UniProtKB/Swiss-Prot annotation, chain B:
Expressed in which tissues: Calprotectin (S100A8/9) is predominantly expressed in myeloid cells. Except for inflammatory conditions, the expression is restricted to a specific stage of myeloid differentiation since both proteins are expressed in circulating neutrophils and monocytes but are absent in normal tissue macrophages and lymphocytes. Under chronic inflammatory conditions, such as psoriasis and malignant disorders, also expressed in the epidermis.
Topology versus the membrane: Peripheral membrane protein
Main location group: secreted
Protein keywords: Antimicrobial, Antioxidant, Apoptosis, Autophagy, Calcium, Cell membrane, Chemotaxis, Cytoplasm, Cytoskeleton, Immunity, Inflammatory response, Innate immunity, Membrane, Metal-binding, Methylation, Phosphoprotein, Repeat, S-nitrosylation, Secreted, Zinc
Function recorded in the entry: S100A9 is a calcium- and zinc-binding protein which plays a prominent role in the regulation of inflammatory processes and immune response. It can induce neutrophil chemotaxis, adhesion, can increase the bactericidal activity of neutrophils by promoting phagocytosis via activation of SYK, PI3K/AKT, and ERK1/2 and can induce degranulation of neutrophils by a MAPK-dependent mechanism. Predominantly found as calprotectin (S100A8/A9) which has a wide plethora of intra- and extracellular functions.
Subcellular location: Secreted; Cytoplasm; Cytoplasm, Cytoskeleton; Cell membrane
Subunit structure: Homodimer. Preferentially exists as a heterodimer or heterotetramer with S100A8 known as calprotectin (S100A8/A9). S100A9 interacts with ATP2A2. S100A9 interacts with AGER, and with the heterodimeric complex formed by TLR4 and LY96 in the presence of calcium and/or zinc ions. S100A9 binds quinoline-3-carboxamides in the presence of calcium and/or zinc ions. S100A9 interacts with amyloid-beta protein 40. Calprotectin (S100A8/9) interacts with CEACAM3 and tubulin filaments in a calcium-dependent manner.
Residues bearing the modification S-nitrosocysteine: 1
Residues represented out of the complete protein: 3 to 86 of 114
Protein name: Protein S100-A9
Originating organism: Homo sapiens
GO molecular function, one term: RAGE receptor binding
Residues reported to bind Ca(2+) 1: 21, 24, 26, 29, 34
Length: 85, 84
């Protein structure tokens, strides 16, 4: 709504962007390695410019974020990336 | 720099957190007072009904304070997005 603060609008956008990529393949609510690499390469071109230059590094970031090591990133796991920057 | 919409969002969540966390005590964390102010001013819609009861807002924080030190680190705070 118009009443939505900037924090609220930005939270909604992060949620939508996560699901925009997580719905693509496999389970709709999580990012497998390919979905994560695509989000990182297309939408974190700047915040992860260095890392993006070594696929193995991105894979390593995913393993760090994948708390329960089920090879999938849930929303709660993925957002921790924000705190790692 | 052509920051993506995602990077802008993240910048905004980091700036807002820090806008409130620098106000009292430790600059890097939100205490109960800073958290209440952040919710009162910037989560008026997402937490409209809860904002009517500051005891509810205090419970929300206890819930987010994983290591129970009465301070919310950025990592603890952002989990709120998951509770929506
Ligand atoms: C209803 C809202 C989320 C609303 C939301 O999604 N706003 C966007 C609009 C859609 C959610 C976000 C955090 C939740 C609270 C905390 O967990 C603490 C505590 C845990 C207990 O077990 C039950 C009571 C209480 C106060 C919980 C209540 C309620 O559940 C809350 C306020
Ligand atoms: Ca998926
Ligand atoms: Ca996982
Ligand atoms: Ca503080
Ligand atoms: Ca804490």
């Amino acid at each position: 709504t118009c009443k939505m603060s900037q924090l609220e609008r930005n939270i909604e956008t992060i949620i939508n962007t996560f699901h925009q990529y997580s719905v693509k393949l496999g389970h709709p609510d999580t990012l497998n390695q390919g979905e994560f690499k695509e989000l990182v390469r297309k939408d974190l071109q700047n915040f992860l410019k260095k890392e993006n230059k070594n696929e193995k590094v991105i894979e390593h970031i995913m393993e760090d974020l994948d708390t329960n090591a089920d090879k999938q990133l849930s929303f709660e796991e993925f957002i921790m990336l924000m705190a790692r920057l």
